[PDB]
């Protein structure tokens, strides 16, 4: 709990300030603690640990929940969309780390970025598989590759979350979910 | 040109390192220059100036190009999508600033973030208007608000760009454009 307390405060600070601006001193004060160094040697160690939490909450569960959704790929896609929305409400900080730590701009450095890139690819792979299945079933269109279509699904998902970070006083994590689902399934055209 | 040289190098560095890790010393060395301080008093000043460039390249042109696209809203949406793809190929760094400087995680601070948030909203507004027009025309669906649908279009766009930053050796700025257009217009379902 002293450990959870550290991780959660770090996570809040990274999200509000960025990784570079956040310091162990700041995390320690917020967490209510020298103490911090005995749990984690460095700030580094703290982000890496946060990435593992993210993988556990966001990514580890996907294979089973997808397998068990159905009967066809459309129901599975809806399930993925609904699970992501739920994570966006309840664990948005973890989601944001996966989306942004996995690019240079975040300022974490290559070791941390590489771990996030890997976790992202694991998630994406499940989406690409789902799309491919639907194409086999005749549920989803086949005029584009499952790889490209999956990227679109992940891109929309990433953007929606970032948009909450952009305008929290005007929307919630769920505000955009129906529109997201509607567009991904049937598009804008009547 | 000495000014362009500074801005372009700063922009490259911010994108690769993040804003906080980048220093005027680093920008000055890359740019081939005390000199820097006479053009720009601070790093700050440099990002703000980059935000103005971004508004000029990305946002200022939208109203006219949209007005002149047609005849109906579908053609206009395609035009917006194609223009954004083009910016993603040619001025990706500027696009990335608008998407990410407009949230806390980027680490720029409130003044800079607020300017980016404003520029973003201006772009979004044009998209919301386009969607609303299409709804009036009977081209686009009306079971969701034009505000929510517009957010989905912007979200997909933001994510696609970030995905290039994520995996540049596996895709280009254009790789995802057909799939993006296809999904936004007609969705995944056959």
Residue numbers in the entry:
A (entry chain A), B (entry chain A): 15 to 47, 50 to 206
What does the published report state?
The mbd cluster encodes the anaerobic degradation of 3-methylbenzoate in the β-proteobacterium Azoarcus sp. CIB. The three-dimensional structure of MbdR has been solved revealing a conformation similar to that of other TetR family transcriptional regulators.
The crystal structure of MbdR was determined using multiple wavelength anomalous diffraction data, and it was refined to 1.76 Å resolution. The crystal structure reveals that the crystallographic asymmetric unit contains a monomer of the protein. Helices α1 to α3 (Ala-13 to Phe-54) make up the N-terminal DNA binding domain and contain the helix-turn-helix motif. The larger C-terminal ligand binding domain of MbdR consists of helices α4 to α9 (Lys-57 to Val-204). A 2-fold crystallographic symmetry operator (arises in space group I222) sits parallel to α4 and generates a dimeric arrangement. The dimer interface is formed mainly by helices α8 and α9 with small contributions from helices α6 and α7. In total, the dimer buries 1759 Å2/monomer of surface area with mostly hydrophobic residues. An electrostatic surface representation of the MbdR dimer structure shows a positively charged patch at the N-terminal domain of both monomers, which might contact the phosphate backbone of the target operator region as in the cases of other TetR family proteins. Binding of 3-methylbenzoyl-CoA would require the movements of helices α5, α6, α8, and α9 in MbdR, similar to that described as the “induced fit” mechanism of QacR bound to its ligand.
